[PDB]
Structure 1
């Protein structure tokens, strides 16, 4: 499934973004009903981060988290979560520390087939000055569904399943993905060392490389787009262009890499993978995971009303439990678009494979009924309108 070979950057001789934080339950919170408390952190760089869920101020010990992944702009996101049963008295919060934060930040818990398909592999390596190899985390996605992962800190040293429908694949599959992913981790190990040497950075600092591969297919599952991009310290380094036959080098180090990869016909070999292999395995996964991968889950929508004063109210339009993640929430007033005085949250994972989002508008108390929330999602044959 993964590409077979990765070539290092060269021949033989740091962005700081602060985390956004959302603290929320997976399901509407009812006292006495088991639930999951989520702390979603996103848009941060570098990837090192400290996240604790708190109950009445005390660290919760049985807290798990998602495999490190990143967005198009190379910023990282992680879901931390624990199972809990809300009560009336208990208070929960998320405590985050990161190199961009002078003090820890505490956010209180306030309480048909898809129209197109993609496969993505994301790789992150973080050097560890002073001893040993980089931390290496790889994840694979079909659409918005993670299905494999490799974590160098995990005990198995194996590519591991993260979706039920990938477990069908036989031992040969897991041996091959394990072999390829470990080879990719060594490419990054070399790359981190040579990049440090190109930029004359000290051995005492931790740096990051990020790599992504993927293919897109349209509603017919035929090849639409292929991608391959590489970043150093959260910044573009080199990217394969749309035509899959040339490169975009961001600086002179990447320009040397472009020359090494051009002479070695990297793009020719990647084109065959992105155009063929990648799509073929995507289609195989879509067929084996059909029950979920080919199912759209329309958003479950409702509205809440919050009065902060006698003259001011907040209307919140909620979209819950939807899949895939792409969704549009808009407000209208008297049937015309309204963007003034609105707030939209980043779409976030519920933790059960579905996604959540809300949109809010501040309105004059008594005028709620002028406003309508409009929900567009490919699981809906027609957009939804909600009104208080």
Structure 2
């Protein structure tokens, strides 16, 4: 609504090559914008923005750290133990995403959802381990064999409910600075890969825009063609996105078409690029 993130969450990719070889990769986000890096072999963190910490103190921050740091060390130490027990076949990979998010007015819902084998495996709902059917024998086996650790559960709830929005709203503000900033676009037509030799590949780029939401159509005057193939919003390593958008048409009909480009950062002052001639 107010333009920018709406949630913060962590991510964990712990890959298991074998009984004593595990590598875990963690990071912290706000939608696509990663604000937290976890330097692994050490156990620390990597704040990628002054406002990475969030109205939180060098005292509480450094506090979360050990939680995470130890969790990771523990999470692995454990999996390798029950590895035979739960009859795991190496190599496997387990992912995890957890955080909270704002919603249409003032209700903050959190979440923690794990996976295994690139598949759903467990979801936490109303504070309780919920075995995604996607798992099976093992999911129940774990979901249950783990509830019997109130301390773990204890920590899981707090961070997940208490500690999360306290932080979320915290950083969102702490960084509304450039999180709500506005970078205008770019744009440049170009034609390439011919469909049926005699037709044309109208290609209308659009780069550097931020925020992410954006408009782009191969129109002709007041109206549009909609045969316009809206590409994917890929990303630039700088916190802005790219976006192709092809149009399929015949030799003549090309000329006289343009690429309109709305955006929260332009203010009715759209980008228009007409389909010129010869010189590409």
Q: Does the Cα contact within 8 Å between 1:115 and 1:219 map onto a contact in 2? A: no
Contact 2:9 2:29 survives alignment (8 Å): yes
1:252 paired residue number: 137
Distance 2:241 2:69 in 1: 31
129 and 152 in structure 1: CA distance in 2 versus 1, 3 angstrom threshold? same
Number of the residue aligned with 1:353: 239
* TM-score (structure 1 length as normaliser): 0.57
Q: Which runs of structure 2 are paired with 1:357-372 in the superposition (5 Å)?
A: 357-368=243-254, 371=257
Aligned pair partner of 2:28 in 140, 153, 158 = 140
Quote the residue 1:338 is aligned against: 226
For residues 267 and 185 of structure 1, the distance between their equivalents in structure 2, rounded to whole angstroms, comes to 15
1:152 deviation in Å? 2.2
Partner of 2:62: 175
Q: Higher strand fraction: Structure 1 or Structure 2?
A: 1
1:223/1:279 contact within 8 Å kept: no
CA distance in 1, matches of 2:109, 2:261: 28
Q: 1:149 to 1:293 in 2, by over 3 A?
A: same
Distance 1:136 1:290, change over 3 A: same
Tell me, in whole angstroms, the C-alpha distance in 1 between the residues paired with 2:261 and 2:156. Answer: 39
Indicate the residue corresponding to 2:113 in structure 1.
229
1:323 maps to 2:210: yes
User: 1:158-205: CA deviations, max 9, x gaps?
Assistant: 11212222368654245323312222213431225535542342xxx4
The 5 A counterparts of 1:1-388 are: 113-114=2-3, 117-129=6-18, 132-153=20-41, 156-166=42-52, 171-189=58-76, 190-191=78-79, 193-195=81-83, 197-201=85-89, 205-218=90-103, 222-241=106-125, 247-249=130-132, 250=134, 251-262=136-147, 270=156, 273-298=159-184, 300-307=185-192, 311-327=198-214, 329=216, 331=218, 335-336=223-224, 338-339=226-227, 342=229, 344=231, 346-368=232-254, 371=257, 373=259, 375=261, 379=265, 384=270, 386-388=272-274
SS of the equivalent of 1:152 reads coil
User: In 2 relative to 1, CA 267–185 (structure 1 residues): closer, same or farther, beyond 3 Å?
Assistant: closer
Shift of 1:366: 2.9
Provide TM-score, normalisation by structure 2.
0.76
- When residues 279 and 171 of structure 1 are mapped into structure 2, their CA distance, relative to the original with a 3 A threshold, is closer
Structure 1 residues 174 and 276, CA gap change in structure 2 (3 angstroms): closer
CA distance in 1, matches of 2:58, 2:107: 28
5+ residue gaps, structure 2, are 275-280
SS at match of 2:63: helix
Q: How many angstroms does 1:239 deviate by?
A: 1.5
Larger radius of gyration, structure 1 or 2?
2
Taking the aligned partners of 2:83 and 2:261, their CA distance within structure 1 comes to 46
CA distance in 1, matches of 2:96, 2:66: 17
Residue deviations 1:63-103 (CA, integer Å, cap 9, x gap): xxxxxxxxxxxxxxxxxxxxxxxxxxxxxxxxxxxxxxxxx
How far apart in 2 are the matches of 1:246 and 1:171? 32
Taking only aligned residues, the RMSD between alpha carbons, in angstroms, comes to 3.6
Q: Name which of structure 1's ranges 208-217 and 311-320 shifts more when overlaid on structure 2.
A: 311-320
Equivalent residues of 1:144, 1:324 under 8 A apart: no
